[PDB]
Amino acid sequence: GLLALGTPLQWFESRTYNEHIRDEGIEQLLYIFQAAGKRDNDPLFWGDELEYMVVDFDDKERNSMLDVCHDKILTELNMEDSSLCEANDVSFHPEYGRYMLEATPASPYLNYVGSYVEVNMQKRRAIAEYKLSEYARQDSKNNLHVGSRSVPLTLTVFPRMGCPDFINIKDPWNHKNAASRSLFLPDEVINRHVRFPNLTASIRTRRGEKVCMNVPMYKDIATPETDDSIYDRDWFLPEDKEAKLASKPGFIYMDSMGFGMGCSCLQVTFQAPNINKARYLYDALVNFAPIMLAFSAAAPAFKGWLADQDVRWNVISGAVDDRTPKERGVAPLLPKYNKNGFGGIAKDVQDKVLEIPKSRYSSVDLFLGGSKFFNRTYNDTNVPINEKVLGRLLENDKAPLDYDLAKHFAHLYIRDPVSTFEELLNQDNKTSSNHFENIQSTNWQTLRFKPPTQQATPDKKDSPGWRVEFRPFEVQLLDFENAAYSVLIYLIVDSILTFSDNINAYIHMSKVWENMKIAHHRDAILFEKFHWKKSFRNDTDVETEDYSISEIFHNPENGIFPQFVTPILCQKGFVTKDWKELKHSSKHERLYYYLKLISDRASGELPTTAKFFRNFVLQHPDYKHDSKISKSINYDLLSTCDRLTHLDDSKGELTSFLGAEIAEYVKKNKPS
Numbered sequence: 007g008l009l010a011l012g013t014p015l016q017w018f019e020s021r022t023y024n025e026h027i028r029d030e031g032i033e034q035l036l037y038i039f040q041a042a043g044k045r046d047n048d049p050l051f052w053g054d055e056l057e058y059m060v061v062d063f064d065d066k067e068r069n070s071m072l073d074v075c076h077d078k079i080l081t082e083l084n085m086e087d088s089s090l091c092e093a094n095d096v097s098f099h100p101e102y103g104r105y106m107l108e109a110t111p112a113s114p115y116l117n118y119v120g121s122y123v124e125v126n127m128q129k130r131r132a133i134a135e136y137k138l139s140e141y142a143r144q145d146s147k148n149n150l151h152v153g154s155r156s157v158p159l160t161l162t163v164f165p166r167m168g169c170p171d172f173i174n175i176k177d178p179w180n181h182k183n184a185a186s187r188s189l190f191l192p193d194e195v196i197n198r199h200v201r202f203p204n205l206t207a208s209i210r211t212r213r214g215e216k217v218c219m220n221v222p223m224y225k226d227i228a229t230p231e232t233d234d235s236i237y238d239r240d241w242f243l244p245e246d247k248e249a250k251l252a253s254k255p256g257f258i259y260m261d262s263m264g265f266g267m268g269c270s271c272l273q274v275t276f277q278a279p280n281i282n283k284a285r286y287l288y289d290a291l292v293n294f295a296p297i298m299l300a301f302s303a304a305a306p307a308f309k310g311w312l313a314d315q316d317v318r319w320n321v322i323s324g325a326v327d328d329r330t331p332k333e334r335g336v337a338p339l340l341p342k343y344n345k346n347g348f349g350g351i352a353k354d355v356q357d358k359v360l361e362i363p364k365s366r367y368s369s370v371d372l373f374l375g376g377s378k379f380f381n382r383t384y385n386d387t388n389v390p391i392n393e394k395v396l397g398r399l400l401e402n403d404k405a406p407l408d409y410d411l412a413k414h415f416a417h418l419y420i421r422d423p424v425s426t427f428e429e430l431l432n433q434d435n436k437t438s439s440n441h442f443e444n445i446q447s448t449n450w451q452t453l454r455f456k457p458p459t460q461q462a463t464p465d466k467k468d469s470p471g472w473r474v475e476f477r478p479f480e481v482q483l484l485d486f487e488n489a490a491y492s493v494l495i496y497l498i499v500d501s502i503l504t505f506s507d508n509i510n511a512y513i514h515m516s517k518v519w520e521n522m523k524i525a526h527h528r529d530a531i532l533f534e535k536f537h538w539k540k541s542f543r544n545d546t547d548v549e550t551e552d553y554s555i556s557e558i559f560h561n562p563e564n565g566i567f568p569q570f571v572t573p574i575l576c577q578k579g580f581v582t583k584d585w586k587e588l589k590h591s592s593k594h595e596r597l598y599y600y601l602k603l604i605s606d607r608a609s610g611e612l613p614t615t616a617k618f619f620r621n622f623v624l625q626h627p628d629y630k631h632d633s634k635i636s637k638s639i640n641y642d643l644l645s646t647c648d649r650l651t652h653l654d655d656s657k658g659e660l661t662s663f664l665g666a667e668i669a670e671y672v673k674k675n676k677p678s
């Protein structure tokens with residue numbers, strides 16, 4: 007669904023309501039617990055969110071651009087073509103990028119739904135390409151976007167973001183981009199819904215410096231020693247003078263929110279039976295997050311460069327990192343503009359500013375606890391909290407909370423609201439969660455623990471309950487892959503929820519954080535090791551060893567297949583003994599190829615999308631052994647991606663990417 011209208015407040019004007027917004031959202035949250043705290047026996051509803059990028063192929067010029075001119079698609083799919091969507095069980099909404107689409111099923115899946123995830127993902131995609139073909143008929147007749155061919159691709163990263171000729175707007179630099187003030191992204195990369203340029207502007211003003219994301223450059227025989235795309239400019243002070251100071255030799259420099267929030271992911275959200283199981287599930291999924299990031303890697307290039315990393319995470323982390331240099335415990339790059347390293351923080355609250363170790367977009371900070379295996383000593387890392395919020399969640403007359411749950415919320419509330427509408431400044435806290443949502447939705451982490459609304463009282467059985475969002479997955483090109491990875495986590499969640507008396511997944515948080523750094527390394531999946539529990543079926547045991555992704559998926563004692571997946575499949579009767587029995591299942595064959603694809607990637611038998619892209623660039627005739635992705639390499643890569651998406655093996659690319667057995671299989675068998 008399309009986002010409702012508002013008048014955003016810009017940072018200088020909105021910062022004055024930070025405490026008001028925090029206070030009133032805490033009250034809203036208290037009403038939610040008071041109303042929905044005792045929900046129970048909620049069904050296992052779940053659903054995915056896919057994010058897409060609309061790419062314009064200029065086949066005559068050999069240039070694939072991002073398409074920032076067909077964003078009406080989102081309004082039309084939510085207006086006069088919404089009937090198409092509803093009939094087809096899909097729903098569409100905006101994302102940060104003006105070229106992006108997001109789509110979900112219109113109703114959650116319930117329990118195990120087989121091939122229907124993939125069916126539903128194919129329908130989302132077929133409806134987007136339908137709309138796009140309609141525009142191509144209109145444009146033809148109005149003689150517009152002549153030569154151009156727009157295709158939705160589930161890319162994690164656009165390899166040429168912020169590089170010359172990367173958007174289908176002639177001469178986008180003939181005006182200034184006051185929102186991001188980036189050297190590379192015109193503000194047309196941003197979706198027109200006012201929230202998005204608001205967040206962009208708000209986060210930069212608060213920080214008092216452009217966002218800054220330095221990603222290690224892959225080092226080839228002829229790679230420049232610096233990011234030679236940086237340039238001096240004079241539109242904006244201080245921002246146009248930052249790059250010289252902020253960049254680093256051997257690092258890709260990115261300076262704008264769209265480099266991160268202009269990237270895409272797969273997400274899956276699950277409803278637990280009640281809040282307690284929701285805490286248990288959340289805690290248990292914490293170390294799956296860095297593992298699945300590493301496993302799904304789909305981002306080996308940024309801003310026209312091959313990177314020495316394989317996932318998007320740290321780039322998105324920096325893109326919305328509103329921390330002043332004070333909060334980061336570093337000097338302002340330009341002390342004359344960034345007064346005392348406080349950026350846009352009001353002086354009459356600079357005395358309350360904390361040093362905060364992680365960006366508001368970062369891995370989970372705290373186990374919620376509240377289950378039998380939990381011990382507060384597993385929360386062993388630096389996690390600042392808003393003490394006032396903790397105090398109030400502990401002592402109040404609506405819903406006093408246990409200390410571990412209170413500390414989760416209090417950590418979330420160390421942040422300021424960065425997107426605030428004038429209209430919404432005073433709410434009815436009994437019925438509204440908008441203020442709480444303000445902070446909740448702008449703490450972006452590897453999981454999200456989702457309260458219901460005040461409306462979701464236990465008697466109302468169909469309301470959304472206590473939910474856990476699983477956020478780390480990179481998005482893959484094929485709907486077959488995304489459904490494989492969606493069902494994977496489904497089966498892991500069902501496993502956790504089913505065997506909850508016996509699964510101890512606790513490890514020290516400091517280890518998870520370390521895993522998150524390791525998951526970024528180039529080819530991590532193929533050789534790096536990760537702290538993973540030695541056993542899950544052991545009261546009090548929180549011993550880890552360091553296991554490869556292959557061992558983490560396949561070890562009999564602690565592996566995802568033998569301890570999570572296979573046990574749930576036996577238990578639900580899909581198999582007697584082993585997951586591989588599905589190959590010869592009459593009802594369940596596709597589930598076999600889903601799992602086989604996963605296992606073969608986890609063992610290094612099939613490449614990740616990140617590796618496939620990297621090979622593609624490195625093996626390209628025009629590649630100049632210097633780390634650069636040119637318009638021409640970009641064009642061929644994305645043509646390949648278009649063929650892969652569409653199971654087009656005419657050039658053997660699908661066989662090359664999925665191997666013969668899976669390729670032949672998806673080419674001859676449609677999900678149904």
Ligand SMILES: Nc1ncnc2c1ncn2[C@@H]1O[C@H](COP(=O)(O)OP(=O)(O)O)[C@@H](O)[C@H]1O
Binds near residue numbers: 112114276470475
């Ligand atoms: N009751 C429910 N339990 C679990 N998941 C749900 C439920 N209702 C909807 N979902 C799924 O939650 C996700 C919500 O998507 P979205 O509106 O994109 O929210 P957000 O951006 O906050 O994650 C979708 O995948 C949707 O299918």
Ligand SMILES: CCCC[S@](=O)(CC[C@H](N)C(=O)O)=NP(=O)(O)O
Binds near residue numbers: 055477
């Ligand atoms: C600025 C708005 C961001 C909304 S978002 O957090 C983006 C997810 C990101 N594209 C990623 O690759 O991790 N998805 P949702 O809010 O639909 O869960």
Ligand SMILES: [Mg+2]
Binds near residue numbers: 055108
């Ligand atoms: Mg969403």
Ligand SMILES: [Mg+2]
Binds near residue numbers: 055101108
């Ligand atoms: Mg999203």
Ligand SMILES: [Mg+2]
Binds near residue numbers: 055273475
């Ligand atoms: Mg989401």
